[PDB]
């Protein structure tokens, strides 16, 4: 049998957000002319210049 | 930032009997290299004093 106090409840949730996917489209992302890339040790990629 | 084949290509090119499309450039820089081992010539050292 339907009984309305068995059945009325509060549903709870928030009012409003929003979903991002892409987070990467949140970073601008630059880089240094090639001529000047270090590598780990600091010094330039490729010195024969 | 400078790259120094053009100085030795020029210089190369000046000796008049090479044919520098036939010279790579790693022969170049190896040429670069040699060069820069060797002391300025007094005239040109002290003007750049």
Do not use: W
Not at chain 1, 12 to 40: G, H, K, Q, R
């Amino acid at each position: 049998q339907f009984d309305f106090r068995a059945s009325m409840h509060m549903l709870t949730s928030n009012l409003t957000f929003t979903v991002y996917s892409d987070l990467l489209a949140f970073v601008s992302a630059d880089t240094v002319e090639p001529i000047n890339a270090v590598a780990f040790d600091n010094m330039r990629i490729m010195n024969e210049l | 930032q400078k790259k120094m084949k053009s100085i030795v290509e020029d210089f190369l090119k000046r000796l008049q009997i090479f044919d520098i499309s036939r010279v790579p450039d790693d022969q170049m820089y190896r040429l670069r290299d040699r060069l820069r081992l060797l002391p300025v010539e007094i005239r040109r050292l002290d003007i750049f004093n």
